[PDB]
Design a protein around this ligand. Structure first.
Ligand code: A1AYF
Length: 209
């Protein structure tokens, strides 16, 4: 059972802008996704200060970067608070609507794509380097879901049958053919040290086989 939804017109417009605009500084996608992971990890850590049982699905708070040249995927895994089904369909899209509008206005005033995170829609910077994005997520109050979109105006949501995560979010970047440099270890290290050197959680860069 796969459910297909339409993006809001404004969100689809943002995705087309990111995909079509000529912009060479693509490497900032990693900074945005790492920052999204750090924000979700902050949330579950704060919630556990008043409720230790919220960590029953995993005490570790960390971020993993997993490149896979065989599948041509780059995966950003965090053990943060995760996302409910309403998040995937309604809540994050409500927030992204006003953030997109502010992002569009700033761009016409001289801002560039690298400041996308200041408007709360940094996730969509993933489409600078990815033709398809899959998001596996598990919230303490909901089931494990798989979100997916190759842009084009629609996204799908399904109950995930893969390996259970416990809690957190898994963002799988199906990279474009000419963006395979972000599967190389030295490139990922250089980007992490350049834009994410002070993240308050351990970032483990997996290496390939
Ligand atoms: O992680 C994510 N952030 C988003 O804005 C996008 C839509 C909602 C949930 C899945 C994606």
């Amino acid at each position: 059972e796969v459910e297909t939804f339409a993006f809001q017109a404004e969100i689809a417009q943002l995705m087309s802008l990111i995909i079509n605009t000529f912009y060479s500084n693509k490497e900032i996608f990693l900074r945005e996704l790492i920052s999204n992971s750090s924000d979700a990890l902050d949330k579950i850590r704060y919630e556990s200060l008043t409720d230790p049982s919220k960590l029953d699905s995993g005490k570790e708070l960390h971020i993993n970067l997993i490149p896979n040249k065989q599948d041509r995927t780059l995966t950003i895994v965090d053990t943060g608070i995760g996302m409910t089904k309403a998040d995937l369909i309604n809540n994050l899209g409500t927030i992204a609507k006003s953030g997109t509008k502010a992002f569009m206005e700033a761009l016409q005033a001289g801002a560039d794509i690298s400041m996308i995170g200041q408007f709360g829609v940094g996730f969509y910077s993933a489409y600078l380097v990815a033709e398809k994005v899959t998001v596996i997520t598990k919230h303490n109050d909901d089931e494990q879901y798989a979100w997916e979109s190759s842009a084009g105006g629609s996204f799908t949501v399904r109950t995930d049958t893969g390996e259970p995560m416990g809690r957190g979010t898994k963002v799988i970047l199906h990279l474009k053919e000419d963006q395979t440099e972000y599967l190389e270890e030295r490139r990922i290290k250089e980007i992490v040290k350049k834009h994410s050197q002070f993240i308050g959680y351990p970032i483990t860069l997996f290496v390939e086989k």
